[PDB]
Design a protein around this ligand. Structure first.
Ligand SMILES: [Ca+2]
Ligand SMILES: [Ca+2]
Ligand SMILES: [Ca+2]
Ligand SMILES: [Ca+2]
Lengths: 597, 597
């Protein structure tokens, strides 16, 4: 390592909400040196050095009077002298008040590596450990930022207003580096995807197309080949030193009156696998670093928000301060925490403004609605079940447990679970119900790339590789091409047509975004619900039986209010609502009606 | 009908908390008459008459100065005169402050008709519609109060301190009258069971044995052959006049932000079946009647509490006032509402002191813990599941949702679900885990009669008849006799021995009653939890695998705190707790340890 190998964060901005900034400087005996600076607006508060001489922490106070510009930080000591030019940048017009992703938005999820290979010459990069292999389910397939940029029109054309790629941060692992969740450098886009400047261009080109960028961020852990592991800043930088202490995933322990400390500590401090070292956020140096890094990425790349991986696995108090600091900087931003639980109360604990039994406060605006996805997936897979949708209905009834239930992210699927189409039992009619549900519910809708052309996977066992297959048309010489429509089967085309039809339609429905919901108890696996304000009503009625069903419309008259008939958006045909509602086998109708008197 | 066919309630008491009393008088043109009385302490507030001339409602105010004694109520009008002697009774010493059933208690549930036939001569009673048939699963088998009294020693000897029989109120139906849930006379014990005086004697003889009496009460509905149905007091006395409007059981509609009025009304006003007319508690006359009737039974029979059938199906506001009035009269009483939901939030809504989103208040101290029973039953039935107990653990973690979670009633089973032993897959070792769980959890334990000798039933479909088979030894000439132990198989005896061993032991464990609980996340379908105060610790460890398991005791050291070994209460053998815990295949240990420093 040189005298300054790492300066983190590499640059900052003038006029941030939180005036403070702790620089993590890394370099040969840099911690044996005094620091000084001469710049108007900036004051050097203090320096903190640790037993490891190769690190120095420098505390700056950047006042409101401080102007955009650069200055040298001079390090004296050890009979040596060092200069480092530190840059304070000017913020973009309306940076702090930026519009986060909301109920109006629709999210398209991609795995950058598995989406599109716009540049084959960055499939392998000299120095990087893992060699690219498209034939291996866990290998690097070659997808990159160039590829994603090339087809932003496909995404915007589908009707989506947000792009959430899985992490693009450097994952210099020997094995399974494609997934992005084992960071080895927090401030560098993996060169296999492109440069840092390429990531900014992704955000700006998407912005032109009328799309925001949502970064997948990991706070809880890193990769075993992170440059920290060969030169640990502090002995307590990662949890459980050198001996492998795996977590046993007891998530309720942080919100359980009967919880043992052993379970609680095991959950927040335990490693996922031997290759993912768990960060210690109770160390204030680690906490500050993570907060600053994520803010850095938002400001630098013009992100509309974040998805926070493995949310609850980070220190609860850290998460409190983390979500506070980030929402202090961007008060209208949105961040969606991944809390993998099909239980509503377990998820609800983490949302902004939730009154908890233990007095836990949070500023996390959004969470992944795993309960509602799981209930609907169960309802469609369960053949013999007489009234499977009851599970969806009852789960929705629990929304009072969330402080903001209509701000949660609902999804057709993701990279971590069975393909949407396969989860429906490879049934187009059921898949349609799932799609309509997703697009009409009082939630932020998220869609996984490939589900629009009915991609398949295994439904049981662990087979993460099968959920993450290459997007047809992403690679040069692809048989099937989902971008142009070449090589697709009639069913795949119709599925793509429908996703496009429905999502673009959803963009022009403020009644789906901000309006109210009235649902009815499912009866004989049939379900009827309404989106409504004074401007519009949307009746969604679905029949989850392979026999035709007729529902008396007298039951729904507090919503119908005399309306004689309504035009289905899907089929186009007018459906009779006067006396009885005739529903076709395994069918769904989206009926639009005038505003309620 | 005579000039006064019914005077309800038939008598009252001096010195009640609520001073008011509305008499429902029934008789030939009784409603065409003025009422008057001359008694010191009692004032006639007003009379209310309805379009049906055969009924009069008389409002009395019984002041604190009023003495025990009788007086004539004189009815003038129609050119007629009538006398009725009304009795005000003296209350028992400490009647209002009576001790309800609590965590210390243990409940034995019987179906009076299916328990013991102490008197064959009341199997049929002249006048009553349904003839007794012991051979028919839905027939009257002949069980009675005499039979229950005869074997109160068996029940107290088992270790139980409470007796909850299903309703004994007159059910004069043509079909399925044995179950008791279709009342035809609210103020009369069904003559097939005995007289009203016989029911009091049941309570007093049990009290001598150190047992309380818990009455199963139905508030929501009656039987189609209730004497009301042939002479309805008001047109709105029952819901939905003459046309059959069945309920579709959408219980969440009374606690759902997205609920339609149609679902909410359907739940509270819909009939169960064509033969069970739904009472309208929004009629103040019905509300008053039900409240007074249940209070009457408590005071009259010296009940330690109630189990409220089909709880949520009654009007929410009525239930508020109902639970208020009853708890005003008996502040230390306990009442356990049946809210059939495996979901914690749905059940929790009804408990006393629960802060609800809609501002719903309740005074119901207890509810049936269907979530925790269902989670544990799932955990034992699920063979292939790697870690099935996780469901029990996670459900327990949700107790913060209840205002008083440790006051809920947990049960091995009941008359409405598959036999406890059959639910365990006819596995004695699993049944044992279920039993220990029931007896050691921070709950009020309830046990279903027959489960102590491993009675069997079908596990799927509807077969209520199979859950309610005759108790062996209850009838003269029974092959098997569970009271004396004659004809029982080795397994049945050992099961009975264990229930007796454990329940009597539970009586002397205040640490199980009032103490704290610390559980640990189940790992590989093994589970470890602790009951603890400063006096005692109870380690319960169970292994739900047919292979032996070893658990490092270092994990549980915040509870163990150095303890080198402990004596299992079940086997008697000392189990090593120093380094590792050796658990036998499908085994459970109950280890008692000194108080925590
Ligand atoms: Ca590439
Ligand atoms: Ca962690
Ligand atoms: Ca009898
Ligand atoms: Ca009712």
């Amino acid at each position: 390592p040189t005298a300054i190998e790492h300066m983190e964060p590499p640059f900052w901005w003038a006029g941030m909400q939180h005036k403070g900034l702790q620089l993590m400087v890394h370099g040969r005996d840099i911690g044996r040196m005094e620091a000084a600076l001469d710049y108007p607006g900036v004051r050097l508060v203090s320096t903190t050095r640790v037993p490891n001489a190769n690190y120095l922490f420098v505390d700056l106070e950047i006042g409101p009077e401080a102007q955009p510009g650069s200055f040298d930080i001079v390090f004296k000591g050890d009979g040596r002298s060092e200069r480092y030019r530190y840059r304070l940048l000017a913020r973009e017009q309306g940076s702090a008040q930026r519009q986060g992703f909301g109920p109006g938005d629709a999210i398209y999820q991609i795995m950058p590596d598995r989406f599109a290979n716009g540049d084959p010459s960055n499939d392998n990069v000299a120095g990087m450990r893992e060699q690219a292999d498209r034939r291996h389910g866990g290998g690097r397939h070659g997808g990159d930022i160039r590829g994603t940029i090339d087809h932003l029109d496909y995404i915007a054309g589908l009707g989506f207003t947000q792009l959430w790629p899985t992490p693009l941060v450097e994952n210099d692992a020997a094995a399974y580096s494609y997934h992005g969740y084992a960071a080895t450098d927090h401030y560098r886009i993996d060169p296999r995807y492109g440069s840092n400047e390429d990531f900014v261009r992704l955000s700006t080109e998407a912005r032109k197309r009328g799309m925001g960028l949502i970064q997948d961020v990991v706070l809880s852990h890193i990769g075993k080949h992170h440059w920290w592991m060969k030169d640990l800043p502090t002995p307590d930088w990662i949890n459980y030193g050198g001996k492998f202490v795996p977590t046993q995933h007891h998530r309720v322990a942080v919100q359980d009156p009967y919880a043992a400390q052993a379970d609680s500590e095991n959950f927040t401090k335990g490693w996922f696998v031997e290759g993912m070292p768990d960060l210690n956020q109770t160390n204030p140096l680690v906490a500050n670093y993570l907060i600053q890094n994520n803010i850095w990425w938002i400001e630098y790349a013009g992100l509309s928000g974040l998805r926070i991986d493995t949310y609850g696995y980070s220190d609860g108090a850290f998460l409190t301060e983390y979500t506070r600091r980030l929402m202090a900087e961007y008060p209208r931003l949105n961040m969606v925490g991944q809390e993998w639980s099909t239980r509503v109360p377990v998820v609800a604990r983490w949302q902004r403004g939730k009154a908890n039994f233990d007095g836990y406060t949070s500023h996390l605006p959004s969470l992944m609605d795993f309960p509602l996805v799981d209930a609907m997936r169960n309802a469609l897979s369960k053949t013999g079940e007489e009234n499977g949708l009851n599970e969806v209905y009852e789960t929705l009834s629990l929304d009072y447990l969330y402080p903001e239930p209509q701000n949660l992210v609902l999804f057709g699927g993701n990279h971590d679970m069975a393909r949407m189409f396969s989860a429906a039992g490879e049934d187009f009619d059921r898949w349609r119900m799932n799609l309509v549900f997703l697009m009409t519910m009082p939630r932020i809708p998220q869609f996984y790339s490939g589900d629009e052309i009915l991609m398949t996977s295994t439904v049981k066992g662990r087979d993460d590789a099968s959920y993450r297959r290459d997007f047809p048309g992403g690679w040069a010489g692809d048989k099937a091409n989902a971008f142009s429509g070449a090589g697709l089967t009639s069913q795949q085309r119709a599925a793509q047509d429908l996703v496009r039809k429905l999502a673009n339609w959803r963009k022009n429905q403020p009644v789906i975004h901000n309006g109210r919901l009235m649902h009815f108890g499912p009866e004989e696996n049939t379900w009827v619900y309404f989106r409504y304000n004074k401007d519009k009503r949307i009746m969604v009625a679905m029949n989850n039986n392979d026999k035709p069903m007729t529902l008396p419309t007298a039951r729904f008259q507090e919503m119908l209010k005399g309306a004689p008939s309504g035009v289905d958006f899907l089929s186009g045909k007018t459906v009779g609502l006067g006396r009885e509602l005739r529903l076709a086998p395994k069918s769904v109708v989206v009926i639009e009606l005038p505003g309620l008197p």
